[PDB]
Amino acid sequence: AAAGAAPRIIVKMESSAGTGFYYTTTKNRRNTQAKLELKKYDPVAAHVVFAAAA
Amino acid sequence: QLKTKYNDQVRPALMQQFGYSSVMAVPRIEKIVVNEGLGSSKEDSKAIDKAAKELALITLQKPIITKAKKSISNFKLRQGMPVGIKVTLRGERMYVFLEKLINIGLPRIRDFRGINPNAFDGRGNYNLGIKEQLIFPEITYDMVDKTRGMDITIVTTAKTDEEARALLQSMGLPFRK
Amino acid sequence: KRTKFRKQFRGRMTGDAKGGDYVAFGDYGLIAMEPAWIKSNQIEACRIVMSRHFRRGGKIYIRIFPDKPVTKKPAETRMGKGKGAVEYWVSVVKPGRVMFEVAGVTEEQAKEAFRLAGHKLPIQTKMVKREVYDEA
Amino acid sequence: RRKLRTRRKVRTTTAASGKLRLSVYRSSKHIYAQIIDDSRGQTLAAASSAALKSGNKTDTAAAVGKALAAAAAEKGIKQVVFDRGSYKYHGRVKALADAAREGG
RNA sequence: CACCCCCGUGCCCAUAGCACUGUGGAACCACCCCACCCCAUGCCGAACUGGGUCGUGAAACACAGCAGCGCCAAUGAUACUCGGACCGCAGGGUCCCGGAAAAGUCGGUCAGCGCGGGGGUU
RNA sequence: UCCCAAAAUGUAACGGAGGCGCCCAAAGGUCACCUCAAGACGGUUGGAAAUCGUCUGUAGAGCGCAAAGGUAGAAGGUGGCUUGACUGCGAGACUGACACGUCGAGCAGGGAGGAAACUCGGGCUUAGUGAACCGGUGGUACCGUGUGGAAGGGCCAUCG
RNA sequence: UCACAAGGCUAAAACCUUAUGAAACUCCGAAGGGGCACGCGUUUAGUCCGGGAGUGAGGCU
Numbered sequence: 135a136a137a138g139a140a141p142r143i144i145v146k147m148e149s150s151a152g153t154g155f156y157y158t159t160t161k162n163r164r165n166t167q168a169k170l171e172l173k174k175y176d177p178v179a180a181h182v183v184f185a186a187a188a
Numbered sequence: 189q190l191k192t193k194y195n196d197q198v199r200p201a202l203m204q205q206f207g208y209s210s211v212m213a214v215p216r217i218e219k220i221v222v223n224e225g226l227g228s229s230k231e232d233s234k235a236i237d238k239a240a241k242e243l244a245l246i247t248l249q250k251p252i253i254t255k256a257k258k259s260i261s262n263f264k265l266r267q268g269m270p271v272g273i274k275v276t277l278r279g280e281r282m283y284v285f286l287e288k289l290i291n292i293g294l295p296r297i298r299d300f301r302g303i304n305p306n307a308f309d310g311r312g313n314y315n316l317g318i319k320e321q322l323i324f325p326e327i328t329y330d331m332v333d334k335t336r337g338m339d340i341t342i343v344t345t346a347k348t349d350e351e352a353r354a355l356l357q358s359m360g361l362p363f364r365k
Numbered sequence: 366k367r368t369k370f371r372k373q374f375r376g377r378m379t380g381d382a383k384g385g386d387y388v389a390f391g392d393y394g395l396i397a398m399e400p401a402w403i404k405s406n407q408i409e410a411c412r413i414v415m416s417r418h419f420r421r422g423g424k425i426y427i428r429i430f431p432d433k434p435v436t437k438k439p440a441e442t443r444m445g446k447g448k449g450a451v452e453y454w455v456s457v458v459k460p461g462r463v464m465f466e467v468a469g470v471t472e473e474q475a476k477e478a479f480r481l482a483g484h485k486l487p488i489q490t491k492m493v494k495r496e497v498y499d500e501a
Numbered sequence: 502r503r504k505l506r507t508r509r510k511v512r513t514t515t516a517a518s519g520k521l522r523l524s525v526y527r528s529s530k531h532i533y534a535q536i537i538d539d540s541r542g543q544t545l546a547a548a549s550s551a552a553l554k555s556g557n558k559t560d561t562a563a564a565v566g567k568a569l570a571a572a573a574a575e576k577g578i579k580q581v582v583f584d585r586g587s588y589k590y591h592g593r594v595k596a597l598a599d600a601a602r603e604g605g
Numbered sequence: 606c607a608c609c610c611c612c613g614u615g616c617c618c619a620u621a622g623c624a625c626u627g628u629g630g631a632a633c634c635a636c637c638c639c640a641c642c643c644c645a646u647g648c649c650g651a652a653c654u655g656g657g658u659c660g661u662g663a664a665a666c667a668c669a670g671c672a673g674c675g676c677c678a679a680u681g682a683u684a685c686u687c688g689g690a691c692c693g694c695a696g697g698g699u700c701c702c703g704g705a706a707a708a709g710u711c712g713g714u715c716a717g718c719g720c721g722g723g724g725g726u727u
Numbered sequence: 728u729c730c731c732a733a734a735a736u737g738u739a740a741c742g743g744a745g746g747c748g749c750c751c752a753a754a755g756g757u758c759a760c761c762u763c764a765a766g767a768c769g770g771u772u773g774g775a776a777a778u779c780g781u782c783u784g785u786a787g788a789g790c791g792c793a794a795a796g797g798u799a800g801a802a803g804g805u806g807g808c809u810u811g812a813c814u815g816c817g818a819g820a821c822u823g824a825c826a827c828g829u830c831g832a833g834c835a836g837g838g839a840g841g842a843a844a845c846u847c848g849g850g851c852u853u854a855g856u857g858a859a860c861c862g863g864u865g866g867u868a869c870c871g872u873g874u875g876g877a878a879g880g881g882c883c884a885u886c887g
Numbered sequence: 888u889c890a891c892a893a894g895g896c897u898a899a900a901a902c903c904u905u906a907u908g909a910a911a912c913u914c915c916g917a918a919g920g921g922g923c924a925c926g927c928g929u930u931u932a933g934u935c936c937g938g939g940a941g942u943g944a945g946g947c948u
């Protein structure tokens with residue numbers, strides 16, 4: 135969207151699977167503070183949980 | 189405990205007094221309800237801690253923090269924040285704390301001569317809240333900080349106020365005449 | 366006269382008078398005959414006329430009331446740029462509607478106070494006298 | 502307070518489900534577990550517990566689960582839906598369950 | 606259902622609701638009693654839950670009475686109005702033809718139709 | 728979003744009012760549980776309003792924001808577990824001049840909650856948006872100019 | 888919901904009788920309209936594929 139973006143930021147959720155695959159959504163930094171930890175499907179295998187890469 | 193038996197000896201007392209066609213159709217006692225509505229001006233975490241302590245030490249039952257109904261009038265009010273403290277006593281511990289009260293409470297009350305006999309819950313029940321805390325069996329000024337007071341509400345399953353009244357008194361209760 | 370708080374602007378349309386064609390609160394009554402608009406000041410005028418003629422005190426029921434905002438654009442403006450800003454207030458008196466009720470005065474007094482009010486009015490009128498018990 | 506029952510009741514999609522729903526009633530120390538074809542205003546099987554009970558008051562749940570499911574064998578009922586009540590699926594009505602849930 | 610009654614559960618979603626009122630008890634329901642555990646309380650067996658009585662049917666429920674309230678609601682006429690034609694400078698209004706309300710008056714109503722089970726008819 | 732808008736949709740004006748360019752890691756998925764505003768009587772600080780109790784109580788409340796519709800058998804308030812705020816698709820419609828846009832059963836992989844029937848491909852819904860072009864980044868090994876490599880492009884993703 | 892006429896009543900609000908306005912009020916609610924099936928009954932248009940357009944200032948009641 136736009137640059138200034140203090141609350142909510144487009145973060146990319148990259149896999150642990152080392153496949154290559156990632157996701158994108160938004161986190162508030164008011165409430166995530168540290169990191170983001172989520173469990174979604176991987177289409178290069180089946181279902182292997184990612185972490186909030188920059 | 190014993191108080192239960194005394195209720196069961198008030199039961200033919202009120203059966204005989206009122207001529208009830210049934211023994212369950214007689215005034216009984218549902219819960220005791222202890223409120224502690226400090227807050228509004230007392231926004232101190234320390235203070236609601238103290239009220240928790242005091243309540244837990246007299247009533248022998250954990251107390252609930254009844255928050256602000258989120259009504260925020262001109263003066264000091266707000267959304268979801270501690271403003272009152274409730275402890276609902278019924279059954280056993282009701283009878284235990286209530287006997288603690290007739291026994292050691294209103295007697296040890298500074299300048300005591302009974303309470304208001306003019307009608308309460310005209311539906312047929314009766315409340316009565318009580319002030320000071322320096323008039324107690326368990327509360328001490330040698331185990332607190334400042335000085336407070338509370339609220340008390342019984343539910344007589346009566347049908348009018350004369351019948352409530354009767355139950356109350358013959359259960360052992362001071363009516364200031 | 367005016368309403369006290371509202372929404373602001375309005376519109377215009379017509380057919381015959383809803384309620385009420387009947388004579389409550391009084392013994393004699395004055396009735397519209399024409400689909401007018403009626404401004405505060407026009408009533409104010411009728412009120413002051415009749416109030417004077419009755420002296421102290423009689424009894425005066427001003428049934429009609431101006432809730433309708435009428436606007437007028439500023440002086441010398443080309444159309445558009447907006448809607449005109451609330452010039453004055455009208456009360457949409459439809460025919461047959463009873464505008465006035467007076468009582469505590471003779472028939473004569475009523476006739477006169479009426480006629481005097483009538484000459485101050487944008488529209489023809491007629492006076493009448495009770496029997497209209499549709500309800501009470 | 503009637504909210505729990507009419508809640509789960511509508512939450513059991515009556516007809517469009519296909520399956521048959523199965524009532525209970527363990528409030529008193531007598532129950533009624535009915536089996537209903539919802540749509541048609543008719544009640545199929547059923548297996549009460551007030552025409553002799555052995556003696557058990559809540560221990561007998563498994564019994565009438567097994568008894569009901571027994572009626573279900575004969576009438577030919579293999580599919581089901583569990584219409585509980587204000588009853589929070591725990592002990593007694595869980596017994597009636599597990600019982601019918603094997604003894605079909 | 607054989608006749609009643611009670612328990613569940615439905616179609617119906619107030620002419621089916623509420624109040625006042627009477628009836629009801631071991632035969633279903635209810636309160637009841639106990640709770641260290643299953644289970645559960647933003648606190649408390651109040652509620653969910655669990656072991657079970659007697660006692661009471663007073664509360665609640667079921668049933669009956671009732672038209673105070675609520676709800677349902679005519680005919681008659683009217684409002685408006687398709688479509689035929691008209692008057693008024695205009696605000697607005699009329700005639701013919703069919704359709705036709707709302708509110709109100711008459712009233713109507715303390716519902717009706719099922720399924721299953723239990724328990725009774727010396 | 729409402730009114731205009733003439734009881735189908737649609738419909739203009741420098742006509743009449745008001746919001747948006749977000750927010751939420753729980754405000755989502757599921758599972759389970761709870762019922763509101765307000766007034767009247769009586770209640771230690773209070774005493775217009777606080778917190779407790781009884782009675783009334785179909786919505787006179789609440790829904791992150793505008794309003795409209797909607798909603799008490801929940802969308803409203805609370806808790807447990809959670810990552811369906813998922814890939815590969817899309818029967819069939821709504822809607823637009825086109826491009827767009829919207830709803831969506833059902834199949835596969837593979838998971839979440841539930842005892843289970845089941846529900847979940849974001850949020851009660853309707854705003855929270857930017858077509859191409861040129862470029863950044865992670866994967867991919869489709870083309871690669873004698874051949875084999877590599878520069879470079881292409882594809883899916885994605886940021887400006 | 889907002890606005891409003893006389894009175895009651897009360898400490899003013901709520902509430903009671905009487906009484907009324909509303910594009911952005913609605914317990915209700917027509918005439919008419921719109922979709923679909925038939926054609927129970929008359930009549931002539933339609934739809935699709937392809938060639939050629941012009942029009943996109945409208946005017947009055």
Ligand SMILES: [Mg+2]
Nearest residue numbers: 686687688689
């Ligand atoms: Mg005409």
Ligand SMILES: [Mg+2]
Nearest residue numbers: 701702703704
């Ligand atoms: Mg006619």
Ligand SMILES: [Mg+2]
Nearest residue numbers: 703704705706
């Ligand atoms: Mg007719």
Ligand SMILES: [Mg+2]
Nearest residue numbers: 668669670715
């Ligand atoms: Mg009855």
Ligand SMILES: [Mg+2]
Nearest residue numbers: 733734735920
């Ligand atoms: Mg139209």
Ligand SMILES: [Mg+2]
Nearest residue numbers: 737738739740
């Ligand atoms: Mg146009």
Ligand SMILES: [Mg+2]
Nearest residue numbers: 858859860861
């Ligand atoms: Mg270019």
Ligand SMILES: [Mg+2]
Nearest residue numbers: 864865866867
């Ligand atoms: Mg690349």
Ligand SMILES: [Mg+2]
Nearest residue numbers: 868878879880
């Ligand atoms: Mg490359």
Ligand SMILES: [Mg+2]
Nearest residue numbers: 678708914915
């Ligand atoms: Mg009516």
Ligand SMILES: [Mg+2]
Nearest residue numbers: 942943944945
């Ligand atoms: Mg042009």
Ligand SMILES: [Mg+2]
Nearest residue numbers: 942943944945
């Ligand atoms: Mg043009």
Ligand SMILES: [Mg+2]
Nearest residue numbers: 739944945946
């Ligand atoms: Mg034109």
